[PDB]
Design a binder for this molecule. Structure first.
Ligand SMILES: NC(=O)c1nc[nH]c1N
Ligand SMILES: NC(=O)c1nc[nH]c1N
Ligand SMILES: NC(=O)c1nc[nH]c1N
Ligand SMILES: NC(=O)c1nc[nH]c1N
Lengths: 302, 302, 302, 302
């Protein structure tokens, strides 16, 4: 008898994080880069992409090419990413980039442009796909293959990972890997915690990510019609955490995608919230690597 | 010739409930607990969970494990439930817990923590699944099995039931069971009524539940984009009942799930409504068991 | 070479209707009654109902019984219909009832209760289903069978029809039938027009209905989250027609369903609009039969 | 090794367009005409239409006729188109018509009526369908067949194209064709650019279109509930571009469909935005052909 799920975690007693600056909230802004990395027969894929694009009802096409799907992704790398990088640089808030190995190759300039802005480049896997079914063998060297590309693309290896479309073996291999300080393949808490089942023994930091305060909802069945739906949602999820942080601060992730929030219609909202957030004192805008290194010092694994 | 459906009920003449305090409305706040109880091959299930999670387009996976799906549920037990329990305790309004036997085992501390707050623990079945197809035999001892777990988990047996994903045999077996005062496997009225087709002869109270003033809509195709959609909906459904209650009071159910409303973004709305509701006199916040025992005394079965 | 579709109609020259009272708009409020008439193995159906219910992602079940689905419909006949009848009687605006033969049997009291309020009872077919595939033979006597039930249910035959889920043969048979003054199985205009392809030769009036200013959208993938979405939509579609009616009045249909708008949450919106509409002079609230008889006198078939 | 996708385009350096009048934004209003051109067994199709109609969950029917689907399209040609033509003529802003060959035949009067208003008639293909799978041979003379119809329908050939539901061969054949100045079968930028892979050698202008600032979203799973969702979206996507245009102007496409925006409920929003847009100086309302000819002179292919 063994349950491979921790349904309880900290329970009624979440640790206090003591965010630098005495912030009542810690905000993680995340910009993915998957454009170019997505499904495509050109990449070897047996079908075209269908996930997160204006084509909200798109289906995959076996041994076909979704020219439309492709164009919409192309907006993310071509136009969307730039516009967002100005927004964040504009307010001096830093980013964590969930960058997919194959996309980074295909647009190394923009990666190096991020790296120079001081944004942290976290690994988003070798390719933007669903690992759920992948064989353990072929999945393990996607990771090391991804680990190699970004080190050579960036100058330093990635000490963070996030697959997203995880298969079971995924979070294990991350931890078995070695050189990662954290992962984000959880949406299970409002705070970071050390992975309880690390075979490796070495401390492993978990920084849960989000599928609700994620701009991906602008293209899902359930999701924002206008910008303001995203914004009101972010304000809400801010207000409630800030209010809690008067005695017990927590964090909040914000997921952005080049092809979605980068569209001017939706960018308006993202800036709206930034300004909102910025108007409150005791807010720590930060990269996830900093949250990991903050945790290490603050609440070292025991 | 026999129609097994009562399409008429009270017709033009709903009974007046005389809610304690002379309230013009009776409000039933319900917090489900299904996290840990849901579909999973670890539980014997042939496929992973797909119902009510941020993964609004998730499909079931035969003999697979949806690590993502699991994590999102894990948020309900780990973080969501606690935050909500503070909200309700915060306003001194009481709850009725629709608790699923298997989840209660997996987190007995939080169940006992509820029981101590004074919230009523109603049965939500042995496992959170779709009974629609289950064989009468194997379904009947899920119930008694569920009936045993919560008595031993709580100190008293459950005198209420709600499966949700009912099969035909379900509401019968509930009534054939014996020790239940009511059930909630109806969404067919704005007031409680005695089950008209109880083979058992013994009075059986029906307290219709809701799939519209339910936070579940935040993850369905049709459903709230921002918090305010839930809230405006609740205000509306409040305003119209309160206005009616000037001469004929009725009730209103509110369905909450740990993994959904417990997310800070959506909690803001839930509190918004509570405050709204609280600002009106002649409102009876109550547990369903109290509504059953209120009915017994007020409008005894004949 | 023959195109069985009139893509042009009145073109740039819609006729002026000269609505009684010199109204700048004519409003058709329609309340369906399908509850009890819907799909069900008890009715002979090979599967349960799945269309328009809170169960926004429900699927049909072959030789099964959706107890949940049924309960939600039961709300329409049990509670929803009554509450709405008060709303409309409350403002003295009259209704056109799209009543399905099988539902009318199952709740004759409420039908006769409508008839006494002075509302017009239009035929909605024998059963609430999809005729698209039905054989011409078995479909033709559904209609006459439906035609018989409501005459005996009401005192007068139905001079109007609307199937909704039409099959090709449907609108023909309506016209071949004989005693109907109009039908509504079109959503193709903002005004009534005589059917251009009536084999019968006898004048046939078309009164297009709506699938957008229909409360059905509260349960479809695309559709209102809160009441206000319905209301804002109705105000818009009112404002634009009223503004046009300064020189060229038109009509507007409003589709309501017992099980959907009758829920207090959504009723609030419906009343909101009524009040809105009521606040403007030169608005003709009317039954469709009156619109037919108005047309006859005003713009007789040539 | 050859990647058939330009993921980078202008990168960090989009060209300045110097819009006539020194406008800080260039607005492309587009009204499609597909009604009559859509899928239908009468047209040879093996199934009925299912894309973009109030029937938001409609499925295609093999060798069948969706009478309902048809009626809803019929609203676009019969009523919707006219009402919109007044709106745009009302404000003196000009249109680009994406007109589908088969629809234009079926309603030549309305086409010639557009042509006389001074609106540009761009080709939207021979038939409104999905070319993705079409054989290169039979697809190539759809285009020339479409090219012939509109020249004879309009007086001048179409120097622009947009299929929408493109297959790979599509944009190639457009360029191989010869007499087109641009195409719009991209959604990959916020500015026009010369096609980088034109086999023909001759300059080919790309004017990316939109699937987000498109009224089509009113009938998709993700999309506007009320008018205001469309409008707020347009204001946002306007505000952000206008703000950028203080130093670097760009354009914005607006997709409209007769059967969707032409409904009074949604027309209100479209006018709302027009007025909004109109209230700002330095806005260039224009046809796409003018944007092509503007580009030619301003930023000639090299
Ligand atoms: N964050 C993401 O875009 C993602 N990565 C894998 N699956 C996803 N949804
Ligand atoms: N209330 C519930 O979460 C539920 N229980 C069974 N099916 C459901 N939707
Ligand atoms: N109006 C209706 O509810 C209807 N009737 C047949 N199909 C429908 N959608
Ligand atoms: N713009 C359009 O309506 C379109 N044309 C082809 N596919 C589409 N969605």
């Amino acid at each position: 008898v063994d349950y491979p799920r921790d349904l309880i975690g900290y329970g009624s007693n979440p640790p206090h994080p003591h965010w630098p600056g005495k912030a009542r909230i810690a905000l993680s802004f995340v910009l993915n880069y998957e454009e170019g990395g997505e499904r495509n027969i050109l990449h070897g894929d047996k079908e075209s992409e269908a996930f997160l694009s204006e084509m909200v009802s798109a289906q995959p096409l076996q041994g076909e090419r979704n020219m439309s799907m492709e164009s919409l992704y192309e907006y993310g790398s071509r136009a969307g990413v730039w516009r967002i990088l100005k927004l964040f640089k504009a307010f001096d808030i830093p980013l964590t980039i969930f960058a997919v190995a194959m996309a980074a190759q295909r647009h190394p300039d923009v990666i190096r442009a991020m790296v120079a802005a001081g944004h942290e480049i976290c690994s988003h896997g070798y390719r933007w796909i669903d690992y759920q079914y992948m064989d353990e063998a072929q999945e393990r060297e996607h990771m090391l293959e991804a680990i190699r590309i970004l080190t050579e693309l960036t100058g330093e290896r990635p000490l963070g990972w996030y697959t997203g479309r995880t298969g079971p073996n995924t979070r294990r291999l991350v931890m078995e890997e070695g050189g990662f300080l954290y992962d984000c393949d959880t949406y299970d808490d409002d705070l970071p915690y050390w992975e309880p089942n690390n075979p490796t023994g070495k401390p492993h930091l978990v920084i849960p990510y989000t599928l609700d305060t994620n701009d991906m909802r602008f293209t899902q069945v359930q999701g924002f019609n206008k910008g303001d739906d995203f914004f009101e949602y972010l304000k809400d999820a801010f207000d409630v955490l800030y209010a809690e942080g008067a005695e017990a601060p927590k964090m909040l992730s914000i997921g952005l995608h080049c092809r979605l929030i980068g569209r001017p219609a939706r960018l308006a909202a993202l800036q709206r919230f930034i300004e909102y957030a910025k108007s409150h004192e005791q807010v720590w805008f930060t990269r996830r690597v900093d949250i990991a290194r903050h945790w290490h010092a603050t609440h070292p694994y025991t």
